[PDB]
Amino acid sequence: MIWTGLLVGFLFGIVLQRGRICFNSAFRDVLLFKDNYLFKLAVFTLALEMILFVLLSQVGLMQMNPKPLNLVGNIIGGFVFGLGMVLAGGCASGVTYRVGEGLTTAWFAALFYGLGAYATKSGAFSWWLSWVGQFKSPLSVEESAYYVKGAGPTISSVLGLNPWIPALVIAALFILWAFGTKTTSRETKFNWKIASVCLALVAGLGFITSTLSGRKYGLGITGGWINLFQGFLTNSPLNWEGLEIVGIILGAGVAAAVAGEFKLRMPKNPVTYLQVGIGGLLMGIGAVTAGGCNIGHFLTGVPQLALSSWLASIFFILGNWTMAWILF
Ligand SMILES: CCCCCCCC/C=C/CCCCCCCC(=O)OC[C@H](O)CO
Ligand SMILES: CCCCCCCC/C=C\CCCCCCCC(=O)OC[C@H](O)CO
Ligand SMILES: CCCCCCCC/C=C\CCCCCCCC(=O)OC[C@H](O)CO
Ligand SMILES: CCCCCCCC/C=C\CCCCCCCC(=O)OC[C@H](O)CO
Ligand SMILES: CCCCCCCC/C=C\CCCCCCCC(=O)OC[C@H](O)CO
Ligand SMILES: CCCCCCCC/C=C\CCCCCCCC(=O)OC[C@H](O)CO
Ligand SMILES: CCCCCCCC/C=C\CCCCCCCC(=O)OC[C@H](O)CO
Ligand SMILES: CCCCCCCC/C=C\CCCCCCCC(=O)OC[C@H](O)CO
Ligand SMILES: CCCCCCCC/C=C\CCCCCCCC(=O)OC[C@H](O)CO
Numbered sequence: 001m002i003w004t005g006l007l008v009g010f011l012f013g014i015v016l017q018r019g020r021i022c023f024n025s026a027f028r029d030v031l032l033f034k035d036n037y038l039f040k041l042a043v044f045t046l047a048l049e050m051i052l053f054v055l056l057s058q059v060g061l062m063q064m065n066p067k068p069l070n071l072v073g074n075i076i077g078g079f080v081f082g083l084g085m086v087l088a089g090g091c092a093s094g095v096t097y098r099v100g101e102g103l104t105t106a107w108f109a110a111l112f113y114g115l116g117a118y119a120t121k122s123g124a125f126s127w128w129l130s131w132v133g134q135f136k137s138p139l140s141v142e143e144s145a146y147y148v149k150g151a152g153p154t155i156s157s158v159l160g161l162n163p164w165i166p167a168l169v170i171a172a173l174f175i176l177w178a179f180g181t182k183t184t185s186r187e188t189k190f191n192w193k194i195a196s197v198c199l200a201l202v203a204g205l206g207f208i209t210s211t212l213s214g215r216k217y218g219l220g221i222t223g224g225w226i227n228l229f230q231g232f233l234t235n236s237p238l239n240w241e242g243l244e245i246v247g248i249i250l251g252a253g254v255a256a257a258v259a260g261e262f263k264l265r266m267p268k269n270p271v272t273y274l275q276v277g278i279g280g281l282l283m284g285i286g287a288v289t290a291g292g293c294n295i296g297h298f299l300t301g302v303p304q305l306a307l308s309s310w311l312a313s314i315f316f317i318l319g320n321w322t323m324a325w326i327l328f
Helices: 004-019 023-032 037-058 071-087 094-101 104-122 126-135 155-159 164-180 192-212 222-234 240-258 271-290 294-299 307-327
Strands: none
Touching: 004 094, 004 192, 004 240, 023 037, 023 071, 023 294, 023 307, 037 164, 037 192, 037 294, 071 126, 071 271, 071 294, 071 307, 094 104, 094 240, 104 126, 104 222, 104 271, 126 271, 155 164, 192 240, 222 240, 222 271, 271 307, 294 307
């Protein structure tokens, strides 16, 4: 059953590679290249996931599991994760999926992303994670058809509303925005409309099949890399998230090769390698501290209306802006 992560990861990697999904550049392309493609893709996918997650929970195929709120962890970890993603040339799992494209810089970043996240959870940096955990909010939701017992607070739980209500309100506003302003300049057939539906269906399949394997969450990155390193160095068995990372790399590699876009590549200057390795370390430190990455928090947690995920994605962007100015 854990092997469904390979299939979901495979399909996930295809969607990432064909759409060039890099959420962090959505706010940059709209102001600097007049390209709202990633922005439209982001808001539309979140809206569909808002509706899809609550619908699949209503029919008993899954339960939403919002990540716990930790003000210190979500903010500081999110900010640091934003810094490292710029140094690492990071992306919406681009450190992961561009490994299958043939970018040797991504090979470094992933290694240092995996090591740093491993070190922060259980190694030399775990003293910092242990200190951060003292600020965890005790706010929780109780068991229902919509939520796993003990999950983090959400927009509806705080407001005391059925999760259908803010999901339908915020998604309707998101859909109105994505279609209101008609998108500007891009000729890929894999347009933001078809890519949002595919990405939402993959995220729905991910949430359903992972729950059957015992991991009650949707798509993620950081936990899969830790599970892979743990299995290689401790002989621990792999789980759904570990085989998902394998599938992502495999899926992006297949898509890049079929489209003629695979090529082993090197940066123009070797110092980029040192730059993306510190980025991977910061990404590993920041993602574990914040309790999720651009996938576990932003893509998967925001549609669940999780307060921790919305707060962490705010500082993903602020950390991105900060390091983007430091570098450029
Ligand atoms: C760290 C754990 C990693 C686990 C996952 C690792 C396996 C996934 C790798 C897929 C790369 C696929 C490589 C595809 C190579 C394409 C070659 C090509 O396209 O060559 C064209 C050229 O014209 C010559 O004929
Ligand atoms: C991680 C990169 C994401 C890039 C795509 C963002 C899409 C925004 C929609 C939902 C996000 C929910 C989180 C709320 C915070 C995001 C909005 C924000 O930070 O806006 C700042 C400023 O207005 C900008 O010009
Ligand atoms: C950090 C983990 C990184 C894991 C590694 C990344 C995934 C695999 C990448 C490349 C392998 C493919 C080999 C590339 C060689 C070109 C493809 C090929 O097979 O070419 C044969 C040629 O056509 C005969 O004439
Ligand atoms: C033996 C190995 C020692 C490890 C050596 C490397 C330390 C990196 C670890 C965490 C830094 C993560 C980001 C730190 C953000 C600092 C801002 C802050 O709030 O500091 C709190 C203070 O550290 C609370 O005692
Ligand atoms: C955004 C525009 C397109 C919208 C597309 C989505 C369609 C939504 C239709 C009905 C949802 C609201 C009614 C669904 C039933 C909710 C009430 C309910 O059954 O709750 C039972 C109990 O609370 C737990 O088992
Ligand atoms: C009860 C049903 C519940 C829902 C179940 C859904 C099952 C279908 C899922 C996805 C199909 C849509 C996939 C669309 C793929 C389009 C690929 C594309 O864009 O093709 C470009 C073309 O090949 C360039 O030459
Ligand atoms: C509803 C609950 C789940 C039910 C089961 C739903 C299964 C949906 C899974 C995958 C569909 C999308 C798969 C990815 C298709 C990608 C096609 C593509 O990327 O084509 C680009 C084209 O080549 C131009 O560049
Ligand atoms: C089958 C192993 C083939 C050789 C490994 C390729 C090189 C790995 C080196 C770095 C990648 C770090 C993550 C690699 C993930 C490997 C997962 C693994 O080895 O799992 C063992 C399993 O847990 C036992 O029951
Ligand atoms: C929930 C209020 C109803 C209106 C909703 C409007 C649409 C979404 C706008 C903002 C939500 C984003 C939330 C981002 C995370 C904030 C959580 C937070 O800051 O909590 C501080 C608190 O003091 C810790 O004890």
